[PDB]
């Protein structure tokens, strides 16, 4: 059998998902999540498909920036694995509450 050592498929996926532009969060689960979030705010609201798509683009961009800063923090802590403390520190430094 052939089995890549850990860290090879991870890097290949990193390059693959940086080269492309397609959405990474599945469309229907994110639509349902957005509707769930909006349900607590005002009932019987409808979303244009472009609005859900815009929310998805913004959320993916925000999460990719967050994971970039989290990876920077993990490298700063002499680690390779990002941990919840990494994300928490990145969010605190960025100025998020």
């Amino acid at each position: 059998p052939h089995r890549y050592r850990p860290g090879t498929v991870a890097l290949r996926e990193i390059r693959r998902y940086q080269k492309s532009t397609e959405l990474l969060i599945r469309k229907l689960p994110f639509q349902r999540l957005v509707r769930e979030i909006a349900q607590d705010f005002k009932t019987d609201l409808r979303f244009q498909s472009s609005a859900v798509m815009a929310l998805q683009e913004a959320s993916e961009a925000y999460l990719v920036a967050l994971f970039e800063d989290t990876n920077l923090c993990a490298i700063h802590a002499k680690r390779v694995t990002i941990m919840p403390k990494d994300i928490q520190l990145a969010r605190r430094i960025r100025g998020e509450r």
Partner: protein, 83 residues
Amino acid sequence: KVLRDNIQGITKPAIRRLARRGGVKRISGLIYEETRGVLKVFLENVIRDAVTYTEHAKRKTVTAMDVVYALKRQGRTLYGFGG
């Protein structure tokens, strides 16, 4: 229909792909929880604004223009859905 616990619809592989696009090589198993919560905290900050726009326009449909304006207010300007 009532919607409950759809936050898990953002699957562990989805969080993994988002991190890989962000350059992360190794992801702890406890990340996939925190990120989801973080993601929720993001949406509750965008949608609350967008709905606030939609409520003002005497509308019941949250348009892409409302979400774009909400993101512009939050200092996260978005290009590609009108301006």
